[PDB]
Symmetry: T
Amino acid sequence: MKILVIQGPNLNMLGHRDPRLYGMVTLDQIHEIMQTFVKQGNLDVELEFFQTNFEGEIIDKIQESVGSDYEGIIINPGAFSHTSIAIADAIMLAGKPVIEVHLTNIQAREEFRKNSYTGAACGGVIMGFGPLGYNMALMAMVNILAEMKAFQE
Amino acid sequence: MKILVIQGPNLNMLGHRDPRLYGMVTLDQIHEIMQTFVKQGNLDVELEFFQTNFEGEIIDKIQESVGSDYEGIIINPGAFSHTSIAIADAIMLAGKPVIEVHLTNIQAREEFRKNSYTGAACGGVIMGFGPLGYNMALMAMVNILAEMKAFQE
Amino acid sequence: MKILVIQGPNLNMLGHRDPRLYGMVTLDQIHEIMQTFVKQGNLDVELEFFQTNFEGEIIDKIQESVGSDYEGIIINPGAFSHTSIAIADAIMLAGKPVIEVHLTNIQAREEFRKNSYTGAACGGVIMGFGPLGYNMALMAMVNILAEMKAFQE
Amino acid sequence: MKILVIQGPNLNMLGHRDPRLYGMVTLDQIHEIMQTFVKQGNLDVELEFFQTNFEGEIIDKIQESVGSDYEGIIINPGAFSHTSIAIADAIMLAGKPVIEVHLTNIQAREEFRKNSYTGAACGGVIMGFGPLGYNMALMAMVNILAEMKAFQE
Amino acid sequence: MKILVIQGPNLNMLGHRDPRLYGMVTLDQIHEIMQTFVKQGNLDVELEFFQTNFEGEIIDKIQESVGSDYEGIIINPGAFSHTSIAIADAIMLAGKPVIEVHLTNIQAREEFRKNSYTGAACGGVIMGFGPLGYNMALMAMVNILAEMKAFQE
Amino acid sequence: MKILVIQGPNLNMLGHRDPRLYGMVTLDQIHEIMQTFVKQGNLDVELEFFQTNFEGEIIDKIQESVGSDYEGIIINPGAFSHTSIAIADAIMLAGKPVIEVHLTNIQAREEFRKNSYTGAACGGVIMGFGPLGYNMALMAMVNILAEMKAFQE
Amino acid sequence: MKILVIQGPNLNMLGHRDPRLYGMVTLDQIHEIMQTFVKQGNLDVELEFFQTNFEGEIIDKIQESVGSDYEGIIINPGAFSHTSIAIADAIMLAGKPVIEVHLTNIQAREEFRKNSYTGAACGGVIMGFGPLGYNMALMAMVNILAEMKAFQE
Amino acid sequence: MKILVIQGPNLNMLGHRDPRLYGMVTLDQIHEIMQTFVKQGNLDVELEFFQTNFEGEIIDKIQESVGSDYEGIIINPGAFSHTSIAIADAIMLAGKPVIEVHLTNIQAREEFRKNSYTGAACGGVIMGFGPLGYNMALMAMVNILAEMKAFQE
Amino acid sequence: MKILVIQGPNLNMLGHRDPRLYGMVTLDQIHEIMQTFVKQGNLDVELEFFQTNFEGEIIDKIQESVGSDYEGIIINPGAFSHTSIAIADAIMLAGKPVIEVHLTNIQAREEFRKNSYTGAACGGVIMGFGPLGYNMALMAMVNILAEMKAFQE
Amino acid sequence: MKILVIQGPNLNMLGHRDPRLYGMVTLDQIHEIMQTFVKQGNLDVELEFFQTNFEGEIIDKIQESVGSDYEGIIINPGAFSHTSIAIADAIMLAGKPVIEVHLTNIQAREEFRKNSYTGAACGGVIMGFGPLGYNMALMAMVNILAEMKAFQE
Amino acid sequence: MKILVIQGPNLNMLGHRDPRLYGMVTLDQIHEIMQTFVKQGNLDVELEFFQTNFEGEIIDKIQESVGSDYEGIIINPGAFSHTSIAIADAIMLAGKPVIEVHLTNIQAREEFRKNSYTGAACGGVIMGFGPLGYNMALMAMVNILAEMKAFQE
Amino acid sequence: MKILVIQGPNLNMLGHRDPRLYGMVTLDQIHEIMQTFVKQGNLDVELEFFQTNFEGEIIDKIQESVGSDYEGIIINPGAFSHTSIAIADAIMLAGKPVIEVHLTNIQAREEFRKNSYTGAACGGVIMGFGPLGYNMALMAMVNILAEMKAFQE
Ligand SMILES: Cc1ccc2sc(COC3=C[C@@](O)(C(=O)O)C[C@@H](O)[C@@H]3O)cc2c1
Ligand SMILES: Cc1ccc2sc(COC3=C[C@@](O)(C(=O)O)C[C@@H](O)[C@@H]3O)cc2c1
Ligand SMILES: Cc1ccc2sc(COC3=C[C@@](O)(C(=O)O)C[C@@H](O)[C@@H]3O)cc2c1
Ligand SMILES: Cc1ccc2sc(COC3=C[C@@](O)(C(=O)O)C[C@@H](O)[C@@H]3O)cc2c1
Ligand SMILES: Cc1ccc2sc(COC3=C[C@@](O)(C(=O)O)C[C@@H](O)[C@@H]3O)cc2c1
Ligand SMILES: Cc1ccc2sc(COC3=C[C@@](O)(C(=O)O)C[C@@H](O)[C@@H]3O)cc2c1
Ligand SMILES: Cc1ccc2sc(COC3=C[C@@](O)(C(=O)O)C[C@@H](O)[C@@H]3O)cc2c1
Ligand SMILES: Cc1ccc2sc(COC3=C[C@@](O)(C(=O)O)C[C@@H](O)[C@@H]3O)cc2c1
């Protein structure tokens, strides 16, 4: 059961500079925290991680998930959340669960960050919990998938 | 370790009518699902549930949590999320973690629902996961509390 | 055949001060005019009147109509018309005819009064006819109910 | 006692196509329903019906009512409600009661339909009751006229 | 197979003044170009041409197409495109293909010209191709009709 | 030397009702005041007066001035000034001086009256001088024409 | 000579948390300061203090002042100032002096706090002077009442 | 009979540079044209001319006109028209006719020039006639004064 | 203990015309009222009064207060309150208490008067109390100063 | 005679999912339809097709057309139409005909889709005709090119 | 070769208070830094420095540069940058290079500071480099002048 | 001492077409001009030049400067300046001086070009000086670096 984790622009710079707002934890560390959570719960999940600064690479990857044995996507589109109708469209055509995560509470920042095009296209949105938000996304993803397949039977 | 769950206007009408958008699950059923989650994880948590249609009662209850042995609040202010500066202020003065939950993805609805005053005052916001969102709030709450007390020592 | 008449904030102050805009007739007098209309037409209707200054009480009352033998609601939400998404939602979940009345023509007043959240959630809206508007609401309610039960057979 | 009923653009297309939103009843049928209401109440009223697609014809007709033995106007300006300051001015200079009717609840439709210039210029506005709204207009007109002439004596 | 071509306000002044923006071709010349296209393709189409400066005449004509053996409408509402909800409604009730044409690219002009109420009600919109845009509308009309009748069988 | 005076919707109702804002003078009286001014100055000017409530008639008349021996237009588009892109276009293609007149100061009224599409298309605009404004238009017109023909030689 | 002091939502939490923006003084301490001012000036005033988190209770209390021997109201509506047309209406019908007080300078905060519906309905507004603002309101109230009764004689 | 002519910022730079938009005529030349008009009509008027670049000097001068034997003001506030509430207030308190003139048609320029605070405070506004606009202002001023004194008697 | 009282544009015209909105009291009379208050309370205060119509003079004066033995400023910027970022900056750099006063309730007037740039830069704002507002400003100033120097010790 | 067809983000996902709004036809099928049109008309045109999800790739390709023997561009920028000033600039510097195509009527969708930066930079725009729109673009392109080269001679 | 350096409101207060945002350097020190730069580069430039708090003095000075042997202007209009259409106009008529400087990055401050009317009228704008910005203006001015006179020959 | 010069979309097309607005100088020529400035001043600077049409490449490059011996960045983000929150974020995390350059005065162009997200994130911004702007950036960069290292010691 494969989950694709997509990390948008600038998230690779996390923690390395300790630049206050986003915190001390690096992107790799966030990804280790995710693995840890997967093992410590015996959840039946293999993660693929992907980070990019290109809007087009985010769309490419969402698209490459379509034909494949990828069950769901957890995504933090970063600054593209607010601007990218294109990623929003790609999310709408993914035909599989997409969950949007934000480290910070984007409700509580500048006006230009409150809107999330991408988040409106997702099933659900998690914001403001730091790295923990990603594990919350994993929990929900596992439940969302469990419930999708339960119904099948 | 006491968590206060506050349920805003109209949420008590959930499920009883099956009114499409919000689902089939009743508010009691959401609260049972929470207890179930608390036991099935052996989490050290006693829940107090409260539902009201009064802005004033939501504020009263947030305030009554202040002096007490209430560790945190999980809240779905419902339609007040978009309008209630008053509840937002109450949340800011609660001096304890507040997590906002929405059944539906309020990013993906009418313009007048995208803004959340109350959500901006909370540490974090969860939207669009149906009842599961509340358990996600629980997970996060337990972790946020764990981490607050870890640092104490 | 029971009709619930809900009167929002400040409407109990009617007439007592003769405060120009709204007129000389008291809220009780409006309610007497309604009974009079019910008898003088031999309409088969028992009215329950309710006035409150609390958003929460309006919602409570709309909700308490749901399980009961209340056939429809006539409501003047007063200044809450313009602000209350919460009452609007309550009206949408009432699953019975709701008609909104206003004494004054809210189209012809300040910008902040032109919007009616609640009115959009109602089947119909009557504005600007003074107390007469309420009898027009009665007429329409009786017809709407007649037509609902005609179709049943 | 003459009442002028003015029907704005496209209302002559009613019912003939059964085009969903507005219903099944034709404009003639609406006018018959009005006569029927006038007889079944023995109201002392002769109706003149007029339908046009021309803003200019609506204004012309409102103006031609001024010198005459027309006591009041019932008007559904249709899509001109939202755009026509010119008809609004005509209504203000009619110096006799004007009541605006809409079949549909214009509060509950697109943003561009919520404004009614013409409705602000009328004494009162009725929306969302289907053809019934016109009889409600008749009821109100008869009362408004009764009350105008009562005060004379 | 009859197509009605409707030309809105001011289009009759085309070319006669060579007034720069719109060009050198007259409205008659646009209509000849259309006939020429119909013959040079052997398309099975009789054109009726109509030009007016009255919003009301455009609506009248759209309505008069309803009962008749008019298969579709090609329309350039001119300045009414931006303002006329009434024509937009008429187009919505025409129950037959309507195609909007603009000589100039209305996206690239003043803000007040970018909105097209009428264009949103049409199946499709062509702008910025000078008189050629009309032939494009003919091509598309013939295809849309071909495809409507193909499906019939 | 022929000047066309165009009077927009409702201006024919002037004075007859003494309806406060616009005054006591009738439209005929305004036109007499113009003739009087033309004689008392020996200006070489024949006036044609035209009043209509139809947008379409205003456009028609501007257009019919084009081929003719009409030297210029004085126009008070009334409520259309604020709404009518169509008339604004007609004015732009008149290829002769157009002067816009308003009785009242449209700067000092409701927001929806401050904009004048038609006024932006005219050479010049006169507002707020009551009927005297028309004579001011005449003066200016005569001067503008004088100066156009002076330059010819 | 009775003055009613109304304190809106959250003001009861003042000072107890020392939550920075509003200060260190408690609501009781604000009320003591007021009594002290009344004695130290020998002003002929009995104060009734009231604090609530309910919009409805504020309206109730304003209304209950109408029939009574309450001469004036000093009110800090708190977060309701910005949102509550209902309280604004109640203030308009109080038919006695109402003075709005704010601890903080609401001009200098978030955009959503600059508007005061309630403040526009009051005779006057005092902001940004901490608890001192209440005594200023007392001074002004005593003067306004002095001047009202002076004129009587 | 004294008329004060106030010329706002930058108008002294007229014509000297021939800077296209405003023309070739200098400010002195405009003032000579005014004198000429006064003589060629035998109008009973002494003009005082004043030009400044200071908002405060415009206000000072308007104020100094109050006590004096200045009968009316003709003013072109220039760029201050759009911005200066202060001059607008000064115009409202002048208690004598003020006419606003603009060389260019400020309706037909940038959005930031369409608003005229000052013009809304004037009795009337003249725009877009070049220097001629000033003589139009003189004509109107003379008539306005004539009519003010006629009534006296 | 010196307080500088700055009076913005047009305030010197007060009362002389009795121009309705602002009242009957002259600016000198307002200043006398202030002296009277200072004596009748034995407050230890010398007032310097200054009125100007120049934005630049207000700024100059604010600046000249900096080096001097001026303890605080009471200012009514008049129409500049709404427009003057420059004065707002000057107030921010005064490094002493500045209190803004308005005779009228600027919340309750035109939209363009609700904003106060200058008021946001002040510690506090008083509006809508007529001349009395100035004495309220004195009371507050004396208290603010008392409290500044109490802390010193 | 080479035409470059550029297909923006997500268009490669067409039809494969049958995702309702855009239809059943795949992108390849759209391109085949284009070739077919080119043959069935004997038009003298070689098409190069290009699809990308990268804004940067669209710009690159537009730029690579400049030096080459590419006569014109037909482009559907997809979601970038609304957001991409950069592509809009590239189109403006292409110095050759660019035609914008949309499958869907972007006038009739969400507010954020009505604006087309790219469409404003194109000579012309076609929307709402499904894949047929591309053939319409071909017809127009061939005519635009024919007319460009006719003039040459 | 004379350069006029104009310094807008409040800039004379620089450094003296060390008021954080703008820095520690006084206005005199900025002017010394400019002389120093002129010598250390042997640039052929005499500087005239001017500081004022009056909008009108800025305009006066720009105007007085016109007739003279002033080659260019470096200007920091301060808070007037955002508000002053009048200075913007003065700049446009200066017919010589004008360069706008800001100490702070006005893009990165409050919304009301992002707009620069004056900056739009300048050839170029420099912001956010502290006092160094002025030397950068000098560099550019010298280059702009060199290039203007190079072309002459 | 290494400076990275980043050139955004379309800038590589400079000069080659002579497309009026931006000029005649090619991007290579701008880079030569920069080297020339570096030698003719003996400044101790090695430049790396980079041009791209990809938002993601700009971010990649800003990021790759972080770990390296790159001292500062000069950047012209081109059309991305107005839209790219992502690049703005990258700039904020670069932890080294970033200077934004624009050839043209973006204040003086379309509304959609006035905003610069990226510019707000930079230390300073230079606009409207053609290619010279880059040398001005160099000058400033060298000074900013000199001053950063001066303080170190
Ligand atoms: C007829 C009907 C039937 C059941 C219910 S429950 C309900 C709650 O109000 C809201 C809840 C949210 O917080 C959520 O999605 O959890 C969204 C919020 O916008 C909405 O007011 C509204 C509603 C309406
Ligand atoms: C002086 C002048 C001369 C000739 C013409 S033709 C004309 C048509 O009105 C309009 C037509 C459009 O539909 C189009 O682009 O074809 C756009 C619409 O905005 C414009 O008003 C307006 C106009 C104006
Ligand atoms: C009840 C009544 C009685 C008489 C009249 S006349 C009239 C004309 O409409 C208008 C004319 C103006 O152009 C003008 O002041 O000359 C202003 C414009 O805003 C208004 O629509 C409107 C109107 C309304
Ligand atoms: C965490 C916290 C701690 C203490 C307090 S007290 C309070 C009052 O609510 C308000 C009062 C104001 O009237 C005022 O400035 O006095 C302004 C209003 O915007 C604000 O909501 C809000 C609040 C919030
Ligand atoms: C015809 C007239 C007559 C007298 C006066 S005095 C005056 C002062 O300007 C203002 C003062 C305020 O600060 C206030 O309420 O004290 C409000 C402000 O908006 C107004 O411009 C404006 C004005 C206007
Ligand atoms: C789930 C889904 C499935 C398939 C596709 S294809 C697609 C293309 O993007 C767009 C194309 C348009 O240009 C058009 O109408 O041709 C409109 C544009 O707004 C839209 O983003 C968006 C999309 C979304
Ligand atoms: C408390 C305070 C203390 C000292 C100073 S100096 C000053 C200058 O005015 C301004 C100058 C700018 O042009 C600039 O950044 O150089 C920005 C402008 O918005 C500001 O008003 C504003 C100001 C404010
Ligand atoms: C047809 C055309 C031809 C050549 C070029 S080069 C170019 C660069 O992009 C931009 C650069 C700016 O940063 C600047 O002024 O340096 C402004 C920005 O808005 C513009 O997109 C835009 C452009 C457009």
